[PDB]
Write an enzyme that holds these catalytic residues in place. Structure first.
Site, PDB file in Angstrom:
ATOM      1  N   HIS B  41       0.849  -1.226   0.000  1.00 35.15           N
ATOM      2  CA  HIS B  41       0.000   0.000   0.000  1.00 35.15           C
ATOM      3  C   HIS B  41       0.875   1.264   0.000  1.00 35.15           C
ATOM      4  CE1 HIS B  41      -0.106  -0.329   4.579  1.00 35.15           C
ATOM      5  NE2 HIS B  41       0.149   0.985   4.412  1.00 35.15           N
ATOM      6  N   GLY B 143       1.727   5.792   9.644  1.00 38.14           N
ATOM      7  CA  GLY B 143       3.165   5.691   9.337  1.00 38.14           C
ATOM      8  C   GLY B 143       3.827   4.458   9.954  1.00 38.14           C
ATOM      9  N   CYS B 145       3.047   1.357   9.536  1.00 37.89           N
ATOM     10  CA  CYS B 145       2.969   0.249   8.557  1.00 37.89           C
ATOM     11  C   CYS B 145       4.375  -0.189   8.161  1.00 37.89           C
ATOM     12  CB  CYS B 145       2.164   0.666   7.339  1.00 37.89           C
ATOM     13  SG  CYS B 145       0.469   1.095   7.788  1.00 37.89           S
TER      14      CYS B 145
HETATM   15  C1  LIG Z   1       0.302   2.730   6.969  1.00 36.77           C
HETATM   16 CL1  LIG Z   1       1.774   3.662   7.124  1.00 36.77          CL
HETATM   17  C2  LIG Z   1      -0.713   3.332   7.898  1.00 36.77           C
HETATM   18  O1  LIG Z   1      -0.343   3.799   8.913  1.00 36.77           O
HETATM   19  N1  LIG Z   1      -2.134   3.184   7.614  1.00 36.77           N
HETATM   20  C3  LIG Z   1      -2.662   2.629   6.392  1.00 36.77           C
HETATM   21  C4  LIG Z   1      -2.863   3.562   5.381  1.00 36.77           C
HETATM   22  C5  LIG Z   1      -3.414   3.139   4.180  1.00 36.77           C
HETATM   23  C6  LIG Z   1      -3.774   1.789   4.028  1.00 36.77           C
HETATM   24  S1  LIG Z   1      -4.516   1.209   2.456  1.00 36.77           S
HETATM   25  F1  LIG Z   1      -3.427   2.030   1.565  1.00 36.77           F
HETATM   26  F2  LIG Z   1      -3.621  -0.137   2.565  1.00 36.77           F
HETATM   27  F3  LIG Z   1      -5.162   1.976   1.180  1.00 36.77           F
HETATM   28  F4  LIG Z   1      -5.384  -0.120   2.163  1.00 36.77           F
HETATM   29  F5  LIG Z   1      -5.720   1.727   3.411  1.00 36.77           F
HETATM   30  C7  LIG Z   1      -3.581   0.862   5.064  1.00 36.77           C
HETATM   31  C8  LIG Z   1      -3.026   1.292   6.266  1.00 36.77           C
HETATM   32  C9  LIG Z   1      -3.143   3.643   8.546  1.00 36.77           C
HETATM   33  C10 LIG Z   1      -4.522   3.061   8.176  1.00 36.77           C
HETATM   34  O2  LIG Z   1      -4.806   1.952   8.543  1.00 36.77           O
HETATM   35  N2  LIG Z   1      -5.442   3.828   7.341  1.00 36.77           N
HETATM   36  C11 LIG Z   1      -6.756   3.259   6.983  1.00 36.77           C
HETATM   37  C12 LIG Z   1      -7.656   3.111   8.235  1.00 36.77           C
HETATM   38  C13 LIG Z   1      -8.931   2.322   7.866  1.00 36.77           C
HETATM   39  C14 LIG Z   1     -10.192   2.927   7.904  1.00 36.77           C
HETATM   40  C15 LIG Z   1     -11.329   2.191   7.563  1.00 36.77           C
HETATM   41  C16 LIG Z   1     -11.199   0.857   7.182  1.00 36.77           C
HETATM   42  C17 LIG Z   1      -9.939   0.250   7.143  1.00 36.77           C
HETATM   43  F6  LIG Z   1      -9.803  -1.064   6.773  1.00 36.77           F
HETATM   44  C18 LIG Z   1      -8.807   0.986   7.483  1.00 36.77           C
HETATM   45  C19 LIG Z   1      -2.847   3.199   9.978  1.00 36.77           C
HETATM   46  C20 LIG Z   1      -3.176   3.999  11.049  1.00 36.77           C
HETATM   47  C21 LIG Z   1      -2.897   3.499  12.318  1.00 36.77           C
HETATM   48  C22 LIG Z   1      -2.346   2.225  12.453  1.00 36.77           C
HETATM   49  N3  LIG Z   1      -2.065   1.458  11.401  1.00 36.77           N
HETATM   50  C23 LIG Z   1      -2.308   1.918  10.188  1.00 36.77           C
END
Ligand SMILES: *[C@H](Cl)C(=O)N(c1ccc(S(F)(F)(F)(F)F)cc1)[C@@H](C(=O)NCCc1cccc(F)c1)c1cccnc1
Ligand SMILES: *[C@H](Cl)C(=O)N(c1ccc(S(F)(F)(F)(F)F)cc1)[C@@H](C(=O)NCCc1cccc(F)c1)c1cccnc1
Lengths: 305, 305
Positions: B41, B143, B145
């Site tokens: 991602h 961040g 991840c």
């Molecule tokens: C990764 Cl560095 C990170 O902190 N993420 C993240 C961001 C984007 C994605 S993805 F790109 F793979 F598009 F797919 F979304 C995954 C992880 C933060 C995060 O999880 N953002 C999405 C939150 C969310 C909302 C609704 C449904 C979901 F399945 C996920 C992150 C924040 C805090 C802790 N870990 C990850």
């Protein structure tokens, strides 16, 4: 999201742990520059631990009687002295892995990471608080002596604790890196009272702020209180008095959450007087006091080192 | 004496963390030999995270679009591929600090240490269990991840977890190092159900053994039970069924303590049916299930690495 008892990354401290042997006693030492620091009870035999005369015991010892081993590498001891309860062994080689570091004497209620060691090798790493009664509730077996407590600020390791002993009660006592005990403890096998411990109020409040930041809000009430009234309740439940310095230090968490410190004090009072009613906060059925307000801010804004 | 949630010493894993940048997204990577492993991602933009076509997104990218930085040292990317949910970046340089290591897919109820990282730098280290529902209850911000979970056996680091995501519920999902998710999770911003979590019975029992080893004995009762009868009570309180394999694994703690496993099962039943009555075990007002029987034996005989 989430909140956990996080230790510092231990890599920089791992590179300083050595094994120190004198007669049949083996314990851990901390190799910084060309000096190795260890508990002076390394020079004690089983027959002298009840009432060691350390000055007399150290006299029967010379540089060659101290065996210092960093991994398989044997260090050469070119000088020894005693500072309070620690031995300083001068070795011929500066530790190539010496990190930027200070020695710090920590204040009660401050936290730090312990790297528990045996035979100069790491077992594991956990976050600890210096209790108000200057003990720590750790995990330490025979041979763990010389294991150290530290905090990290970017690249500088601040050593604050060296493990010396377990009291008959099962809690842990030690010194700063100048060998001065935290609390009234001495390094001999005699019964020693830690004294009444209290709960670190400012830390419980930091943790309630952490809880609100992470969506645990059930304990938030419509009541407020006064420092004086809160403190009447603190003394009853063996909680440390709250001061304006404490209030001032919570300010960031207040400002973040828009919950006034004295409103959180009223929440905390209701919990102390009413209990948790089988509910939980950040996964605990008890009030947690091993997070400083700095520990909450660190964890919540993702400070790296 | 004492019992604590101890992480492994993180030094060997610290030396493998790098920062991986692609467009505006920055996350953490794991540099082993001449390969950098990170969540795929990293290639996603804000407008494609709801429904990324990873194969199509990766196609718009070439080796030069991946910025890998180990400290201030910029690595040169000479190959990229996608394995399941991870990106493998081939770099021109073998990591000089690569430790002896394996990739392991861990089983539910097993434990491991997380080194939480931001911008390729360590924040801290904590012990975690893979829940029966294949989530972890961690501490992870935007961040984090690419942060990894591991166990150590003497000198070999066994990587088992890479952090990918937080669910709307606040719990954490990720993959093994071949990029296969633990549980039913996918790497997109859509609502995802973790499902009913259960308590790791074998681990609670290990912890009750730990408690007895450390002198907490109040919950020990005069009753015994049967696997079948205990299991009738397990299912009621959402506890995992206990099997003869579980009984077999507790054998050392049984043998140490002279408390038969089914006698501890009867103790545990009384706690589940009666609660703790405002008492505490090893400093918890809840039953703890994040220690494996191996974690108790390790901690109680002072295993070093
Ligand atoms: C990764 Cl560095 C990170 O902190 N993420 C993240 C961001 C984007 C994605 S993805 F790109 F793979 F598009 F797919 F979304 C995954 C992880 C933060 C995060 O999880 N953002 C999405 C939150 C969310 C909302 C609704 C449904 C979901 F399945 C996920 C992150 C924040 C805090 C802790 N870990 C990850
Ligand atoms: C040090 Cl490697 C060690 O594990 N000790 C220890 C041994 C001897 C002494 S001493 F030598 F300094 F004579 F003084 F006793 C100090 C520490 C274990 C230990 O604490 N032994 C004594 C226990 C005891 C009994 C009664 C009254 C006391 F004050 C102390 C030790 C075991 C577990 C954890 N830490 C230390």
């Amino acid at each position: 999201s989430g909140f956990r008892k996080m230790a510092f990354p231990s890599g920089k401290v791992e590179g300083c742990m050595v094994q120190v042997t004198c007669g049949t006693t083996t314990l851990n030492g901390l190799w910084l520059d060309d000096v190795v620091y260890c508990p002076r009870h390394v020079i004690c035999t089983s027959e002298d631990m009840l009432n060691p005369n350390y000055e007399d015991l150290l006299i029967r010892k010379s540089n060659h009687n101290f065996l210092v081993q960093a991994g398989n590498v044997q260090l050469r001891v070119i000088g020894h002295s005693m500072q309070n309860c620690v031995l300083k062994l001068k070795v011929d080689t500066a530790n190539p892995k010496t990190p930027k570091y200070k020695f710090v004497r920590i204040q009660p209620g401050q936290t730090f990471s312990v790297l528990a060691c045996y035979n100069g090798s790491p077992s594991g790493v956990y976050q600890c608080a210096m209790r108000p009664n200057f003990t720590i509730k750790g995990s330490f077996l025979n041979g763990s002596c010389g294991s150290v407590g530290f905090n990290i600020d970017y690249d500088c390791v601040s050593f604050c604790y060296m493990h010396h002993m377990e009291l008959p009660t099962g809690v842990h006592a030690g010194t700063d890196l100048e060998g001065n005990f935290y609390g009234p403890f001495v390094d001999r096998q005699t019964a020693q009272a830690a004294g009444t411990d209290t709960t670190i109020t400012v830390n419980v409040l930091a943790w309630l702020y952490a809880a609100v930041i992470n969506g645990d809000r059930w304990f938030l009430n419509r009541f407020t209180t006064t420092l004086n009234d809160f403190n009447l309740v603190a003394m009853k439940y063996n909680y440390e008095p709250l001061t304006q310095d404490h209030v001032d230090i919570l300010g960031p968490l207040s400002a973040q959450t828009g919950i006034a410190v004295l409103d959180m004090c009223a929440s905390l009072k209701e919990l102390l007087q009413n209990g948790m009613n089988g509910r939980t906060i950040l996964g605990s059925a008890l009030l947690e006091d091993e997070f400083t307000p700095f520990d909450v801010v660190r964890q919540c804004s993702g400070v790296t080192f």
